[PDB]
Assembly symmetry: C3
Homo-oligomer: 233 residues x 3
């Protein structure tokens, strides 16, 4: 009989709050179970919209002024840790497989709308421990934002490392560790990942033999190639 901060019952969540000023706003979820929110700090906010499916989702807030927003009609599992003033945003109609992990440290991790994130995907925006230049003696591995654009397919067993942007329509191959930006409409793979194909776009339906066979693919295709013009180095 757990309730969110506005007194709305959320039978799929357990909430533990060790700080002050924290807010959990939760819509009418679908097919959800075994979720947890842990506030280990103050003035944090978790927003989960109507028609989101959360299954075995754990959201942990470390420190203060963190913000996590999960947009409507998405499907999510895994562990999201928002640390020391980080923002984590997951867009509409995005699906995320089991084994998902987000790691932050006063930085931002964003996933656009209409993404397909496979199982065991790690978005690691912080290294966890400091690395320094031996001559300047200053830290050189500060956390850096990860930005996954709308309509990206991230394959199974992939890590995306700090400071990486992945452009719209792109595909990250199984097993990749991505350490550098991937432009729009490209396929990348490897450890470290490299661009392996340019001028591509993906679709969810296995039935589609042409771009026009899938509504969403066609929509993004028109947006990225006709209404706009992309040409990379």
């Amino acid at each position: 009989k757990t309730q969110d901060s506005r007194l709305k019952t959320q039978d799929s969540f357990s909430v533990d709050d060790n700080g002050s000023g924290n807010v959990f706003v939760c819509g009418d979820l679908v097919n959800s179970k075994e979720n947890k929110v842990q506030f280990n700090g103050n003035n944090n906010k978790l927003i989960i919209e109507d028609d989101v499916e959360c299954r075995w989702l754990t959201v942990i807030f470390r420190g203060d002024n963190n913000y996590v927003r999960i947009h409507k009609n998405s499907k999510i599992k895994g562990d999201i840790v928002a640390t020391k003033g980080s923002k984590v945003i997951i867009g509409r109609r995005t699906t995320i497989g089991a084994g998902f992990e987000v790691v932050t440290d006063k930085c931002n991790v964003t996933i656009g709308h209409d993404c397909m994130i496979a199982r065991d995907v790690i978005l690691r925006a912080s290294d966890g421990h400091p690395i320094f230049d031996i001559h300047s003696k200053k830290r050189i591995n500060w956390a850096k934002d990860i930005i996954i654009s709308s309509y990206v397919w991230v394959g199974r067993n992939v890590s995306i490392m700090k400071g990486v942007s992945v452009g719209s329509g792109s595909v990250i191959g199984y097993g990749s560790i991505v350490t550098k930006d991937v432009p729009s409409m490209c396929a990348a793979a490897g450890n470290p990942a490299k661009i392996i194909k340019r001028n591509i776009i993906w679709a969810r339906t296995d039935k589609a033999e042409l771009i026009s066979d899938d509504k969403r693919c066609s929509s993004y295709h028109a947006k990225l190639t006709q209404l706009e013009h992309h040409h990379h180095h």
Copy 2:
């Protein structure tokens, strides 16, 4: 030494399950989600925690005598998965197909957590032609190949006889006979090599199966 190790879930018509006398086998499953599919397992095969799923029609999976298998085989839309004689396959094995073929030869040593991914699972298109460009492609593992642990072999790849795939590899291009390859993506790291199963073999002649294949490979 073990009868009745398979459960059958048949949701179609014309499906065939032909099983020889298995050994040391348990907890196996075959599921037919389609029609006119066939699973044949020969005598003296060991299957443990093997799940074979058929999707669509006209698929064919055959496991030859004296092999040992675990894991998950999914044969989709008229695919053929064939495993040769005396081949051993570790836990965590995965096969993925789509109207294509995946073959493993005789006398192979396939370690744990090996994925043979002949199909990408979702389509990718060229933005200019608008046509799909990632159609499934056959995977062919020749006889007497050692595939190390935690390896994926991707679509369209052939691995030649006597070769070795290193731990943790993702193999995206053909590997010729008698080579060692490793990496992600994998590259050839050594040529003119062959492997053996027993760890006290100091010379090729110390192991009969190694000696046999070495002879065939260096003569042909």
Copy 3:
């Protein structure tokens, strides 16, 4: 040896164990003769398994370290773990008549495999001789090895260096470098790491400052 269950299957095997701290659920198997396991004072062993296969193996874990995982010392191998080194769950050491050493003050993350032996022989087809004999692994003092890493045979990693998440290391890594990839490559030179997340300068962390001074 309260936190240890010992299965001794040979002659002349010795287990010397100091006053452990916070230790539990450990196991040792002596599957051979004349093996030695030595664990110093104030070591934390939790779900550690040490297996000795064959004879004349030696495993020593030095004081004030923390260890988990599985160590297999085979056919006259030596495995040494230095002082004040921390090792995460999923650790594995594989040997065959060779040496694996981790130095002092190391930070070894979860799921790190030190594989000094291939497990099966590979031969040159022309000489017919084996060409993948086991080769020693040396991790120097003050190294951070990231999560889900394998270090393969014959590799040395220099002091102060960092191995990135998910790496497979197949060649030596010099001192004060960061390496990552499969196979791993050097990605940055002239670096050093610290454990404390707060440190913004090398001088913010005692241990970091100490090695930085001695290494430069």
